Design a protein around this nucleic acid. Structure first.
Lengths: 121, 96, 25, 97, 81, 217, 206, 129, 87
RNA sequence: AGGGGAUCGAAGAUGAUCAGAUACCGUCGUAGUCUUAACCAUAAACUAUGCCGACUAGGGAUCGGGUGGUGUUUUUUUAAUGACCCACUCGGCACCUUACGAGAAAUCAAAGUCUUUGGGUUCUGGGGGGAGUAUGGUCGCAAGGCUGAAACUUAAAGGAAUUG
């Protein structure tokens, strides 16, 4: 009987994506910050917005959830997004295919190190 | 395809087929039978003089509700009996 | 009415007419 | 309009199959047009087998299970819950479950 | 694929498709040179016998016809000619 | 003012794209009506239909309004738009916006020899939406536009001067005939002629040679 | 042409044998038969790496032809390839889409997740029949990671590979991310392998 | 049965051309279609087509380069007088400048512009464009 | 398209689907043009030169964009043996 | 016309129902249902899709035939041999997705290759009623079948889908 309607949800998703560093786990603490960073006309609503704030923020710290985005996770993901090595596994470190790769080389008139490994007929 | 004889030498079949199928027309059939000439008050005529015999009030086919000011007339040319509308407002007070 | 009983009633009418028509003939 | 791909029947390329009566109203219908139900139930109730085992000189009993094919006309089947009118797009769903 | 070398399809295609729907309606049957230990005459037998076969020199049965290729007799020595 | 959202709008906002035909040369998709506003300032309209159409609901016959508007100057560009809106005047502006979005060119041909400037269509074209089929038959120079009163104005906007329209089906419906005319009129470039057989170097994307200019994240 | 630097060494060929990237499902559509070598006695079909690896080089050439890595969409729709696509975007621009494609992303500019990509990559046409259908409206070249029995409509570059092999889907991503990087620039010659085993693109439970 | 091999030839080409196939196969490979194909061949509408002469009238394969758009037959082969050849073309040709109608003639099998030029007529075989 | 004195009077020369030579429509939003780079020494594709391929939306609809591309690639040396003409 | 004649069952009779119930329900029950020999020649005789021919997309099963496996499977453990599984193919009843294409759509892999209009060929329709009626002929023991209008009358019936 206490389901949170759309407007409290839409307000809550706004604050999480704008001041995620500024939220705190304690409900009373982040209740107060909703005062001057958001315009809530009724005190009861201000409680509820903070109410879903705690629910969302407790979830977000224990792994990011879809529907939430902010700068910190964008850059933190981007830190995984710059994993590029000098070289890579596909290399001349040792074509090992059936006989068709032997016919693959002489087709165009080029020289390749043909080392064929037969595939089962 | 197209369900009609197309072959170069089947002009008769196409002609007889059209001859039979032209009869399903309405204007065509009335001319061939001459039903306007034979079974019709007008013998292929535009007008026909006659004599009014009575003034009849006819209920108007609904949705309209009205008396339709019609007169029974005898056609001189065939002797038949038809009823005729009188145009214009009044015009039954202008006919006897 | 169905196509049946319209046809059936005309069939009964046709039956009646042929007896009457032949009755004079 | 044309409501079904196969008109109402599992009949393709015959012209005639057989008339079959219905187990409720006794209406002659084609056998394939019928609603076929392999009603597989015991003579007794589910909770009933306990007394039979108690009240039999056969300690290891067989639990017989009767078979009867109820051939149903759709007039009786729909009234008898056996089938349900389905969605037009879901009409094509021929899967038994 | 609409771009296919129907002119020279691989040997997989021919043995896969029907004879009459090939490029050239070539027979796939054959005649078999077949011998029996009890005779001294050769005998050429069609793949699908279509009727009983007997050596002229010695009276014998060779392969009883069936719908397709005939099941040859037990003591029958066959070869493709 | 107008802030574009598509790359096409942002690239047009650079001013690099100035040719409408480039959009159609590369078949560039169109999502913003301002694109044709800037590219074709000389662009007029005219409203064909004002049709009331109602949903029968629990309330009753809530009469929505559908109007069809054609757009395109006589230089060889035409766009036909249909839209359903409750307000009568907003339907005109709602319809034209999609009509701008749906602008299509035309291949103007010659009836006979290649004399003078093009006047008519270069081929007889197939068009059929619904039951209506409109067949645009090329006509000699000066023969006039022989068409339905509604359809002929679509051709007048298109800028073709002579054509024969062979209408089929329930031409009484105006929306289908307009679409059928529109389907047929745009089939000119879908029809191949031997002068077109010559291969082209397949000109590269102005979306990439005018290149990334905006959306500089 | 293409240089001699595009061979499949037996060390990574033996990886492909372990990767199980070459054995498909038990049936094949007629548009994937050029990418099939034979069938096995148990009734299963086989992909030949000679086709896909070349075709995978072709796809990179088209991606390399893209000037802006940020306007190329990489699609995943299942955890079987979610980790790889995000971490395929971990090597180039590759504006990614995770799971649900939120249809209306290529038209319908009003949406917040709207994009104007110049190319798309799909892990699975089956799980993503929709976004490929979206390219039909906005003229996007489509490169698909196709099974032998995956329907291949509206897809320009079909990559025949195993979508049922965990070690396969990330490895086809492992390659596809590799040579684009190689053609991106500042990648050294192809003499030596990666820092660690390639097992790192592959989603683990949990 | 095959009431006209020419009809089934032009039918088959259109069916495959609409599909966009690079090659089409025709049977039973008579010469009238072969003569018909020559007329397209000199007009670039059709590409290299290989005639396969099996001992049962054989068959053909036609590597059409996806060039024409619609080639059809006028069956039966109506006769035509030279004064009315233009009348036929208007009803069949998408345009005067391009597209041809094929006339069989005791002179030979040729498209209409040359049949007009050399001034001889006959019966209509088909139309190409 | 050109008049009696050259000077082509035509909005644009349409593209031909290089797979099937059919003329590209003006609204064929399924039709797509792909660019392929040109590679050079030590396996690096160079921006600046690029080969272009046009595909009609009809071909994509039929799902033949892939094989037709292989026909359009085996000739131009992009791939050695991917499109098997004979099978 | 003859034989047969269990069941069911027109007609009919009954007892209920309703206001009426000579209808539905129940019981009885005649012709009939069965057969021998003839008639009639009709059905929503319908897959409401004439017949023949070619082509165009994929798939899967199924029926019948055929082909191959050092495949399984049958007393003998590659022997005196059917069933099965595999790869197929021919023909059939059909089926699932997709609509390239068509269509008014429902839907159709044929209802596709039809305004880019022509493979051959047969029959049928021209708003609805009147009316499959009257007449006339022919067939039939008859029932009736086949052929088949008109006068007169109306501005619409009708198709497929949408919303209520």
């Amino acid at each position: 009987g206490r389901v949170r309607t759309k407007t409290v949800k839409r307000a809550s998703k706004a604050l999480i994506e704008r001041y995620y560093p500024k939220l705190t786990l304690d409900f009373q603490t982040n209740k107060r910050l909703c005062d001057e960073i958001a315009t809530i006309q009724s005190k009861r609503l201000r409680n509820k917005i903070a109410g879903y704030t705690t629910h969302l923020m407790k979830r977000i710290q224990k792994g990011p959830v879809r529907g939430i985005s902010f700068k910190l996770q964008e850059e933190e993901r981007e830190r995984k997004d710059q994993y590029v090595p000098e070289v890579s596994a596909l290399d001349l470190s040792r074509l090992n295919v059936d006989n068709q790769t032997s016919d693959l080389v002489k087709s165009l008139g080029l020289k390749l190190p043909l080392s064929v490994i037969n595939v089962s007929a | 395809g197209k369900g009609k004889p197309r072959g170069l030498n089947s002009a008769r079949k196409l002609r007889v087929h059209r001859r039979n199928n032209r009869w399903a027309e309405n204007n065509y059939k009335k001319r061939l039978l001459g039903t306007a000439f034979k079974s019709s008050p007008f013998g292929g005529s535009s007008h026909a003089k006659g004599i009014v015999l009575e003034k009849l009030g006819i209920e108007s086919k609904q949705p309209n509700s009205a008396i339709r000011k019609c007169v029974r007339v005898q056609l001189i040319k065939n002797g038949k009996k038809v009823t005729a509308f009188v145009p214009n407002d009044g015009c039954l007070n202008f006919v006897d | 009415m169905r196509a049946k009983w319209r046809k059936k009633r005309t069939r009964r009418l046709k039956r009646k007419r042929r007896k009457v028509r032949a009755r004079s003939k | 309009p044309k409501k079904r791909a196969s008109n109402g029947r599992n009949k393709k390329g015959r012209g005639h199959v057989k008339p079959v009566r219905c187990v409720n109203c006794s209406k002659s219908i084609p056998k394939d047009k019928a609603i076929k139900r392999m009603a597989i139930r015991n003579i007794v109730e589910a909770a009933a087998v306990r007394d039979l085992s108690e009240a039999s000189v056969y300690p290891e009993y067989a639990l017989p299970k009767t078979y009867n094919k109820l051939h149903y006309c759709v007039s009786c089947a729909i009234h008898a819950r056996i089938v349900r009118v389905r969605s037009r797009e879901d009409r094509k769903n021929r899967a038994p479950p | 694929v609409l771009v296919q070398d129907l002119l020279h399809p691989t040997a997989a295609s021919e043995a896969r498709k029907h004879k009459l729907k090939t490029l050239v309606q070539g027979p796939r049957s054959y005649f078999l040179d077949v011998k029996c230990p009890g005779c001294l005459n050769i005998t050429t037998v069609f793949s699908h016998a279509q009727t009983a076969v007997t050596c002229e020199s010695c009276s014998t049965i060779l392969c009883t016809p069936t719908g397709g290729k005939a099941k040859l007799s037990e003591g029958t020595s066959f070869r493709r000619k | 003012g107008w802030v574009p959202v598509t790359k096409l709008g942002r690239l047009v906002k650079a001013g690099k794209i100035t040719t409408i035909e480039e959009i159609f040369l590369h078949s560039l998709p169109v999502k913003e009506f301002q694109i044709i506003d800037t590219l074709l300032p000389g662009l007029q309209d005219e409203v064909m239909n004002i049709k009331p159409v109602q949903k029968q609901t629990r309330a009753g016959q809530r009469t929505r309004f559908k109007a069809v508007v054609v757009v395109g100057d006589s230089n060889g560009h035409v766009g036909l738009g249909i839209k359903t809106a409750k307000e009568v005047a907003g339907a005109i502006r709602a319809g034209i916006i999609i009509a701008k979005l749906s602008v299509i060119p035309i291949r103007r041909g010659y009836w006979g020899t290649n004399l003078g400037q093009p006047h008519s269509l270069a081929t007889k074209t197939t068009g059929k939406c619904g039951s209506v089929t409109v067949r645009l038959i090329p006509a000699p120079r000066g023969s006039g536009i022989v068409a339905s009163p509604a359809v002929k104005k679509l051709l007048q906007l298109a800028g073709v001067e002579d054509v024969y329209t062979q209408s089929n089906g329930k031409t009484r419906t105006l929306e289908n005939t307009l679409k059928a005319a529109f389907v047929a009129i745009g089939n000119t470039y879908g029809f191949l002629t031997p002068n077109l057989w010559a291969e082209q170097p397949l000109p590269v994307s102005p979306l990439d040679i005018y290149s990334d200019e905006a959306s500089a994240q | 042409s293409l240089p001699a630097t595009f061979d499949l060494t037996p060390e990574d060929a033996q990886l492909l044998l372990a990767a199980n990237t070459h054995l498909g499902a038990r049936n094949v559509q007629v548009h994937q038969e050029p990418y099939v070598f034979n069938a096995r006695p148990d009734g299963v079909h086989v992909i030949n790496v000679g086709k896909t690896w070349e075709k995978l080089v072709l796809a990179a050439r088209i991606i390399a032809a893209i000037p802006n890595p940020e306007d190329v969409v990489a699609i995943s729709s299942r955890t079987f390839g979610q980790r790889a696509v995000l971490k395929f975007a971990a090597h180039t621009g590759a504006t990614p889409i995770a799971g649900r494609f939120t249809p209306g992303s290529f038209t319908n500019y009003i949406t917040r997740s709207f994009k104007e990509p110049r190319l798309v990559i799909v892990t699975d046409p089956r799980s993503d029949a929709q976004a490929i259908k979206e390219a039909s409206y906005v003229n996007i070249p489509v490169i698909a990671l196709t099974d032998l029995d995956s329907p291949s409509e509206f897809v320009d570059v079909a990559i025949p590979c195993n979508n049922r092999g965990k070690h396969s889907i990330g490895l086809i991503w492992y390659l596809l991310a590799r040579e684009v990087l190689r053609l991106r620039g500042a990648l050294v010659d192809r003499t030596q392998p990666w820092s660690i085993m390639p097992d790192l693109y592959f989603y683990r439970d949990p | 049965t095959r009431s006209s091999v020419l009809a089934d030839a032009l039918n088959a080409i259109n069916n495959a051309e609409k599909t966009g196939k690079r090659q089409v196969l025709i049977r039973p490979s008579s010469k009238v279609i072969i003569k018909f194909l020559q007329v397209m061949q000199k007009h670039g509408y059709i590409g290299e087509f290989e005639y396969i002469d099996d001992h049962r009238s054989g068959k053909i394969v036609v590597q059409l380069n996806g060039r024409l758009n619609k080639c059809g037959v006028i069956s039966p082969r109506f006769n035509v007088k030279i004064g009315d050849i233009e009348k036929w073309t208007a009803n069949l040709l998408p345009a005067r400048q391009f597209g041809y109608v094929i006339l069989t003639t005791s002179a030979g099998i040729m498209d209409h512009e040359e049949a007009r030029r050399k001034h001889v007529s006959g019966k209509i075989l088909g139309f190409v464009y | 398209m050109e008049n009696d004195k050259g000077q082509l009077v035509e909005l644009y020369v349409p593209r031909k689907c290089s797979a099937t030579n059919r003329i590209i429509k003006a609204d064929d939003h399924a039709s797509v043009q792909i660019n392929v780079a040109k590679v050079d020494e030590e396996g690096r594709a160079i921006p600046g030169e690029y080969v272009t391929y046009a595909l009609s939306g009809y071909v994509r609809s039929r799902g033949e964009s892939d094989d037709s591309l292989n026909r359009l690639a085996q000739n131009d040396g992009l791939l050695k043996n991917v499109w098997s003409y004979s099978r």
